[PDB]
């Protein structure tokens, strides 16, 4: 029993975290096989980063300008290339601790574990969620670039995020392991602002189902409504439009509790009109939308 924000065991990722230094700039790198992945603004300096041209800064660098350090071993760079907003540094030594891995691009709402690293050394791990405005509410300091987000299915570590920069509002933005950013953001210190963030609907509904398993059911009711009328009140508090694919993935959780998905949408509706009135749900006084239906079944069920 119990429901907690659970992160994947970061062991397989700690064996791939290295530090990459270019001049005086330094961040974290991902050492998979004989290739190291890291953000491309490590070749920048403190003076050429407002309007940086990245394709020449690579041509103005050679392999010996990149210093990759795996703990005490200094890895010799035998090749370099740029793919979108990340750098690929081919080293002479393949990582002996390389697990089975893929590179995936997640959709907004999906979650992943973030291993925060500094100077190539891991510091902490925590669960994050791809917000619909293509940001994440993480905890990053200076030098946290290169920290990766991942999901582990059995022994396969699906890498899906790499940290780069921090928005002026406190949130963070990054790219996938192919360099493609998440959102309309670019790796330069120009005036950027994230769009207005919405609320992940399936995540609250799955979070509500996790509470029913743990005893919390004071928010349940008898009301049954329609998807559009629930959406006609979802888009009112502009909760993200709930689809029929969304009602489909909530099925396994709806069958375990016997509560139809449409019945929980009515329990969600009345929660936005009256609030909590001094009551908590799973120890939180607010609707948590950082929990994927898969995250609930993984924790509540076997």
């Amino acid at each position: 029993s119990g429901f907690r924000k659970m992160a994947f065991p970061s062991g397989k990722v700690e064996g791939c975290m290295v530090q990459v230094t270019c001049g005086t700039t330094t961040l974290n790198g991902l050492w998979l096989d004989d290739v190291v992945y890291c953000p491309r603004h490590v070749i920048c300096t403190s003076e050429d980063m407002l309007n940086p041209n990245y394709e020449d800064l690579l041509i103005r660098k050679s392999n010996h300008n990149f210093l990759v350090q795996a703990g005490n071993v200094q890895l010799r760079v035998i090749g370099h290339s740029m793919q979108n907003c990340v750098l690929k540094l081919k080293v002479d030594t393949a990582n002996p601790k390389t697990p089975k891995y893929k590179f995936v691009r997640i959709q907004p709402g999906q979650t992943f574990s973030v291993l925060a690293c500094y100077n190539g050394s891991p510091s902490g791990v925590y669960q994050c969620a791809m917000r619909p405005n293509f940001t994440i509410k993480g905890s990053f300091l200076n030098g946290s670039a290169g920290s990766v987000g991942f999901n582990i299915d059995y022994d396969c570590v699906s890498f899906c995020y790499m940290h780069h920069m921090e928005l002026p509002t406190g949130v963070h933005a990054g790219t996938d392991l192919e360099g493609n950013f998440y959102g309309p953001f670019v790796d330069r210190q120009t005036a950027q602002a994230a769009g207005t963030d919405t609320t992940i609907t399936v995540n609250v509904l799955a979070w509500l189902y996790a509470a029913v398993i743990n005893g919390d059911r004071w928010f349940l009711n008898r009301f049954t409504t329609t998807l559009n009328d629930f959406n006609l009140v979802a888009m009112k508090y502009n909760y993200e439009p709930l689809t029929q694919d969304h009602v489909d993935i909530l099925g396994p959780l709806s069958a375990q509790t016997g509560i139809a998905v449409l019945d929980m949408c009515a329990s969600l509706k009345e929660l936005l009109q009256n609030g909590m009135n001094g009551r908590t749900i799973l120890g939180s006084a607010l609707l948590e939308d950082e929990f994927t239906p898969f995250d609930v079944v993984r924790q509540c069920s076997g």
């Binding site: 330094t26 961040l27 920048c44 200076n142 670039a145 940290h163």
Partner: peptide
Amino acid sequence: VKLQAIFR
């Protein structure tokens, strides 16, 4: 917007 690498 702050690039979260250590610049020295």
